[PDB]
Structures are given as C-alpha cells and as structure tokens.
C-alpha cells in the first residue's frame, strides 16, 4: 500500500529510534517496490552492520555499488564492514576511496572519514605489532 519512498521514510524513522532489524525489514519492503535504488541497500547495509550481520552488510554494499558506483556511503560502510572482519588493507582502500569521492562531491561529515581511516590504520598496526 505504501510506496517505496514512504517505506524508506518509515525505515529511516525506525533507524533513528534504534530499531535496526525493523528498519532493515522496511528497506527490504522498499526494495520490493523499486530494487534499483542504491540508497535502500546502503541504508540496509548500515542496519546489518549494527546487527553484526557482516556477510549481509557486505552483500548490500555490493548491490549498492552496482547501482551507484560513486556512492560515498557504500564505500564507507564496505570499509567499516571489512575492518570489523579484520580485512584491514581492503578496508583502508575503501575508506580512502570514500574520502576521495566525498571530496569530489563536496560532502563533509564532520571529519568522520579521516577519523575512521585513522581508527582502521591504528587497528592494522596493532595487529602487526602483536606479531612482534
């Protein structure tokens, strides 16, 4: 009965309310109405990250990237997913690509992207140092 945009808006309200599995289901309903909108998959990927569902998050980021190759958030969420999975070099590349795309698109997130890069590079270093 509701449209894809209305379902996305319902998902966004649930997300702000910290109802992550419910928000993800709402983005799934939006996808039923229009499966060609990258934002539905990026939003759902972020829900899956919060739910520790990394395999599902990775899959959504890949779907989003097939639809919008320039998506800052798909690259960023992909990098965060790879960092939590300890795939540090891939994570850093995707975070750096998010930074470059954000610069080209004149987007600013209060230094979130550089901050995440530093967190990722520090985690990678900690894993290297612990072998010593």
């Amino acid at each position: 009965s509701p449209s894809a945009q209305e379902l996305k808006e319902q998902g966004n309200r649930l997300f702000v309310g910290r109802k992550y599995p419910e928000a993800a289901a709402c983005y799934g309903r939006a996808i039923t109405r229009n499966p060609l909108v990258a934002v539905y998959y990026t939003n759902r990927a972020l829900c899956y990250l919060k739910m520790q569902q990394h395999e599902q998050a990775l899959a959504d980021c890949r779907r989003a990237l097939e639809l919008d190759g320039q998506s800052v958030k798909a690259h960023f969420f992909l990098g965060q997913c790879q960092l939590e999975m300890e795939s540090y070099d891939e994570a850093i590349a995707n975070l750096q690509r998010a930074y470059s795309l954000a610069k080209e698109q004149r987007l600013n997130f209060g230094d979130d992207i550089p901050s995440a890069l530093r967190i990722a590079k520090k985690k990678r270093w900690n894993s290297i140092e612990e072998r010593r």
Binding site: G11, N12, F15, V16, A23, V39, T42, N43, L46, V72, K73, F76, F109, D112, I113, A116
Partner: peptide, 5 residues
C-alpha cells in the same frame, strides 16, 4: 556519515 539517507 553513519546515518541513513
């Protein structure tokens, strides 16, 4: 950045 669109 960790917000929905």
């Amino acid at each position: 950045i960790e917000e929905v669109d």
